[PDB]
Amino acid sequence: IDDILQLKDDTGVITVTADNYPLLSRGVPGYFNILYITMRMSCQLCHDFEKTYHAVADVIRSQAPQSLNLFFTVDVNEVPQLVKDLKLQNVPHLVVYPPAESNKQSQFEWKTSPFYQYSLVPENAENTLQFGDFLAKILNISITVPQF
């Protein structure tokens, strides 16, 4: 699965495409999947939380290097299957898939697997603290985001 890990762009975030979706949606054993479902005003919300998302991703990579998490970003306009699969009616969404239970790995997929969803609204679009706290609790890590 070193393949998937090496998909991390310069910011440590993995772009879901219509191609790698079937693969990525099956996740990585033991890895949390943090998935930002976006589209580039809901467009403004999408763009705003992008920065927050990356900020916290960076914080987590930096301060929780051991954490088994993968940050994904998906543009709903690039992978329509994800849209159908996740029954998406709008954007953005930030969902977090816990790793599948070892015994239920094969049945893991973003579309059927339970997930935490971060309440993403304009009021917290730029709140790295709240989002960091959200991931921190899920990832069971203690992080300090520069934000007061």
UniProtKB/Swiss-Prot annotation:
Residues 1-148 are lumenal. It is found in: Endoplasmic reticulum membrane. Changing C43S: Alters glycosyltransferase efficiency towards a subset of target proteins. Residues 6-127 form the Thioredoxin domain. It comes from the Eukaryota. Disulfide bonds join C43-C46. Changing C46S: Alters glycosyltransferase efficiency towards a subset of target proteins. Subunit of the oligosaccharyl transferase (OST) complex that catalyzes the initial transfer of a defined glycan (Glc(3)Man(9)GlcNAc(2) in eukaryotes) from the lipid carrier dolichol-pyrophosphate to an asparagine residue within an Asn-X-Ser/Thr consensus motif in nascent polypeptide chains, the first step in protein N-glycosylation. N-glycosylation occurs cotranslationally and the complex associates with the Sec61 complex at the channel-forming translocon complex that mediates protein translocation across the endoplasmic reticulum (ER). All subunits are required for a maximal enzyme activity. Present with 1080 molecules/cell in log phase SD medium. Belongs to the OST3/OST6 family. Component of the oligosaccharyltransferase (OST) complex, which appears to exist in two assemblies comprising OST1, OST2, OST4, OST5, STT3, SWP1, WPB1, and either OST3 or OST6. OST assembly occurs through the formation of 3 subcomplexes. Subcomplex 1 contains OST1 and OST5, subcomplex 2 contains STT3, OST3, and OST4, and subcomplex 3 contains OST2, WBP1, and SWP1. This is Dolichyl-diphosphooligosaccharide--protein glycosyltransferase subunit OST6. It comes from Saccharomyces cerevisiae (strain ATCC 204508 / S288c) (Baker's yeast). The gene is OST6.
